[PDB]
């Protein structure tokens, strides 16, 4: 019969997620800009290690966003497991809830108002760019970042075998960050739709 409270709760939760995912989007785009500079094979090992540090700062920001809590201190990207931070700080692994938070808002409509951290930070777009060798696309944002950061702190001057190895990891990160950004943008499209549905009452 009356969905007033349900719709206010879903508007609030969806607005919060859009607000945090907007920050995730900006941080992913900043890391992509770093990775473009890292594709320059005339960088010295000191320049490369400076880019690594910049990328660590961005990774740390994304980890703080992935472990975002709401007003009441409950984690927003953990599905129903809202009492513990869903991401492991060191590895970026997800161990929050596997089922998204849903809310019925009309006699017929139920919305996915809380996406899991797996859906946001350990998923890539349907439209993913493939690995050139046919191996699996990396799905975990933090892995993409950490593997780049490690390859940028590995000096490569005068050593072609290492130089190619480090440049292959940077290329792979460039592909992942596309794949991850596109996933977040598709989720944001879905939230934009939910807020249109909700505001039409
Ligand atoms: Na898409
Ligand atoms: Zn969704």
Short mmCIF file of C-alpha atoms and ligand atoms in Angstrom, two decimals:
data_model
loop_
_atom_site.label_atom_id
_atom_site.label_comp_id
_atom_site.label_asym_id
_atom_site.label_seq_id
_atom_site.Cartn_x
_atom_site.Cartn_y
_atom_site.Cartn_z
CA UNK A 1 0.00 0.00 0.00
CA UNK A 2 2.45 2.81 1.07
CA UNK A 3 5.99 2.92 -0.10
CA UNK A 4 6.83 6.44 1.23
CA UNK A 5 9.50 5.38 3.77
CA UNK A 6 10.88 2.68 1.34
CA UNK A 7 11.29 5.30 -1.44
CA UNK A 8 12.95 7.85 0.91
CA UNK A 9 15.36 5.17 2.12
CA UNK A 10 16.16 4.01 -1.44
CA UNK A 11 16.65 7.67 -2.65
CA UNK A 12 19.04 8.29 0.17
CA UNK A 13 21.09 5.11 -0.35
CA UNK A 14 21.22 5.49 -4.17
CA UNK A 15 22.31 9.18 -3.84
CA UNK A 16 25.05 8.24 -1.43
CA UNK A 17 26.35 5.53 -3.76
CA UNK A 18 26.25 7.90 -6.78
CA UNK A 19 28.19 10.47 -4.71
CA UNK A 20 30.94 7.94 -3.71
CA UNK A 21 31.07 6.37 -7.22
CA UNK A 22 31.58 9.81 -8.70
CA UNK A 23 34.74 10.10 -6.52
CA UNK A 24 35.79 6.50 -7.56
CA UNK A 25 35.37 7.60 -11.22
CA UNK A 26 37.63 10.69 -10.76
CA UNK A 27 40.30 8.67 -8.93
CA UNK A 28 40.27 5.92 -11.67
CA UNK A 29 40.66 8.64 -14.38
CA UNK A 30 43.60 10.20 -12.37
CA UNK A 31 45.35 6.79 -12.18
CA UNK A 32 44.80 6.33 -15.98
CA UNK A 33 46.53 9.74 -16.58
CA UNK A 34 49.47 8.45 -14.42
CA UNK A 35 49.64 5.22 -16.43
CA UNK A 36 49.77 7.15 -19.74
CA UNK A 37 52.92 8.94 -18.47
CA UNK A 38 54.28 5.52 -17.40
CA UNK A 39 54.02 4.24 -21.00
CA UNK A 40 57.03 6.47 -21.93
CA UNK A 41 60.06 4.11 -22.30
CA UNK A 42 62.55 6.95 -21.98
CA UNK A 43 61.65 7.66 -18.36
CA UNK A 44 64.54 7.29 -15.94
CA UNK A 45 64.16 4.88 -13.02
CA UNK A 46 63.76 7.90 -10.63
CA UNK A 47 60.91 9.33 -12.70
CA UNK A 48 59.28 5.91 -12.81
CA UNK A 49 59.57 5.51 -9.03
CA UNK A 50 58.01 9.02 -8.61
CA UNK A 51 55.01 7.89 -10.82
CA UNK A 52 54.75 4.76 -8.58
CA UNK A 53 54.40 6.91 -5.48
CA UNK A 54 51.76 9.13 -7.17
CA UNK A 55 49.88 5.93 -8.09
CA UNK A 56 50.16 4.64 -4.51
CA UNK A 57 48.47 7.84 -3.33
CA UNK A 58 45.64 7.24 -5.78
CA UNK A 59 45.39 3.54 -4.79
CA UNK A 60 45.16 4.60 -1.11
CA UNK A 61 42.34 6.98 -1.97
CA UNK A 62 40.48 4.23 -3.81
CA UNK A 63 40.90 1.82 -0.90
CA UNK A 64 39.40 4.48 1.45
CA UNK A 65 36.49 4.84 -0.97
CA UNK A 66 35.98 1.04 -1.30
CA UNK A 67 35.88 0.90 2.57
CA UNK A 68 33.46 3.90 2.69
CA UNK A 69 31.06 3.98 5.68
CA UNK A 70 27.79 5.94 5.81
CA UNK A 71 26.65 8.41 8.58
CA UNK A 72 26.08 5.62 11.15
CA UNK A 73 29.51 4.02 10.38
CA UNK A 74 28.18 0.99 8.44
CA UNK A 75 30.18 -0.03 5.32
CA UNK A 76 28.39 0.86 2.06
CA UNK A 77 30.13 -1.57 -0.33
CA UNK A 78 29.79 -4.72 1.77
CA UNK A 79 26.28 -6.00 0.72
CA UNK A 80 24.57 -7.09 4.01
CA UNK A 81 27.92 -7.57 5.88
CA UNK A 82 27.98 -3.98 6.93
CA UNK A 83 29.82 -4.45 10.26
CA UNK A 84 33.35 -5.12 8.91
CA UNK A 85 35.41 -3.38 6.30
CA UNK A 86 34.81 -5.33 3.06
CA UNK A 87 38.27 -4.93 1.57
CA UNK A 88 41.55 -6.20 2.83
CA UNK A 89 43.91 -3.14 2.89
CA UNK A 90 47.06 -5.07 1.71
CA UNK A 91 45.83 -7.31 -1.06
CA UNK A 92 42.59 -5.49 -2.16
CA UNK A 93 40.67 -8.81 -1.84
CA UNK A 94 36.94 -8.57 -1.27
CA UNK A 95 35.33 -10.48 1.55
CA UNK A 96 32.07 -8.51 2.08
CA UNK A 97 28.57 -9.80 1.26
CA UNK A 98 27.98 -11.59 -2.03
CA UNK A 99 24.28 -10.51 -2.41
CA UNK A 100 23.44 -6.91 -3.26
CA UNK A 101 21.10 -4.89 -1.01
CA UNK A 102 17.66 -4.59 -2.58
CA UNK A 103 14.58 -2.58 -1.69
CA UNK A 104 11.03 -2.89 -2.89
CA UNK A 105 9.75 0.59 -3.79
CA UNK A 106 6.37 -0.02 -5.50
CA UNK A 107 3.88 -2.93 -5.72
CA UNK A 108 5.93 -4.26 -8.61
CA UNK A 109 9.45 -2.72 -8.49
CA UNK A 110 12.49 -3.75 -6.40
CA UNK A 111 15.81 -1.86 -6.83
CA UNK A 112 19.38 -2.89 -6.21
CA UNK A 113 20.19 0.01 -3.92
CA UNK A 114 23.50 -1.26 -2.45
CA UNK A 115 25.98 -2.75 -4.88
CA UNK A 116 28.53 -5.11 -3.41
CA UNK A 117 32.19 -4.18 -3.45
CA UNK A 118 32.69 -7.16 -5.79
CA UNK A 119 30.26 -5.58 -8.30
CA UNK A 120 32.15 -2.26 -8.17
CA UNK A 121 35.91 -2.99 -7.56
CA UNK A 122 36.24 -6.64 -8.60
CA UNK A 123 34.14 -6.60 -11.81
CA UNK A 124 34.86 -5.32 -15.31
CA UNK A 125 32.50 -4.10 -18.03
CA UNK A 126 30.65 -6.61 -20.30
CA UNK A 127 32.37 -4.58 -22.99
CA UNK A 128 35.90 -5.48 -21.69
CA UNK A 129 39.01 -5.09 -23.88
CA UNK A 130 40.70 -8.61 -23.96
CA UNK A 131 44.27 -9.56 -23.09
CA UNK A 132 46.31 -9.84 -26.36
CA UNK A 133 47.27 -13.48 -25.63
CA UNK A 134 43.74 -14.62 -24.73
CA UNK A 135 44.51 -15.00 -21.03
CA UNK A 136 41.98 -13.85 -18.38
CA UNK A 137 41.30 -10.10 -17.92
CA UNK A 138 42.18 -8.97 -14.41
CA UNK A 139 39.03 -8.04 -12.47
CA UNK A 140 40.36 -6.48 -9.23
CA UNK A 141 41.12 -2.68 -9.39
CA UNK A 142 43.61 -2.91 -6.53
CA UNK A 143 45.56 -5.68 -8.28
CA UNK A 144 45.74 -3.60 -11.46
CA UNK A 145 47.21 -0.71 -9.43
CA UNK A 146 49.51 -2.69 -7.21
CA UNK A 147 51.08 -4.62 -10.06
CA UNK A 148 51.77 -1.33 -11.88
CA UNK A 149 53.20 0.29 -8.71
CA UNK A 150 55.58 -2.71 -8.20
CA UNK A 151 56.68 -2.68 -11.88
CA UNK A 152 57.40 1.19 -11.65
CA UNK A 153 59.56 0.72 -8.52
CA UNK A 154 61.57 -2.03 -10.26
CA UNK A 155 64.55 -0.20 -11.94
CA UNK A 156 64.98 -1.27 -15.56
CA UNK A 157 67.83 0.94 -16.96
CA UNK A 158 70.09 -0.94 -19.38
CA UNK A 159 68.24 -4.26 -18.99
CA UNK A 160 65.93 -5.02 -21.98
CA UNK A 161 64.44 -8.17 -20.44
CA UNK A 162 63.20 -6.23 -17.35
CA UNK A 163 62.20 -3.20 -19.40
CA UNK A 164 59.83 -5.32 -21.56
CA UNK A 165 58.50 -7.14 -18.46
CA UNK A 166 57.71 -3.86 -16.63
CA UNK A 167 56.18 -2.31 -19.83
CA UNK A 168 53.97 -5.44 -20.29
CA UNK A 169 52.60 -5.01 -16.73
CA UNK A 170 51.93 -1.29 -17.35
CA UNK A 171 50.09 -2.13 -20.64
CA UNK A 172 48.03 -4.73 -18.80
CA UNK A 173 47.16 -2.12 -16.10
CA UNK A 174 46.22 0.39 -18.87
CA UNK A 175 43.70 -2.22 -20.18
CA UNK A 176 42.37 -3.04 -16.69
CA UNK A 177 41.80 0.55 -15.70
CA UNK A 178 39.68 1.05 -18.87
CA UNK A 179 37.74 -2.12 -18.02
CA UNK A 180 37.22 -1.05 -14.45
CA UNK A 181 36.27 2.60 -15.27
CA UNK A 182 33.68 1.32 -17.77
CA UNK A 183 32.19 -0.97 -15.14
CA UNK A 184 31.80 1.93 -12.62
CA UNK A 185 30.23 4.15 -15.36
CA UNK A 186 27.67 1.47 -16.20
CA UNK A 187 26.76 1.15 -12.52
CA UNK A 188 26.39 4.94 -12.37
CA UNK A 189 24.00 4.76 -15.40
CA UNK A 190 21.92 2.30 -13.44
CA UNK A 191 21.80 4.61 -10.30
CA UNK A 192 20.89 7.61 -12.56
CA UNK A 193 17.92 5.51 -13.87
CA UNK A 194 16.86 4.53 -10.26
CA UNK A 195 16.85 8.16 -9.19
CA UNK A 196 14.70 9.07 -12.21
CA UNK A 197 12.25 6.23 -11.30
CA UNK A 198 12.18 7.31 -7.67
CA UNK A 199 11.69 10.96 -8.30
CA UNK A 200 8.78 10.31 -10.74
CA UNK A 201 7.31 8.92 -7.38
NA1 LIG B 1 28.64 -0.22 -21.15
ZN1 LIG B 2 23.20 -2.74 -10.27
#
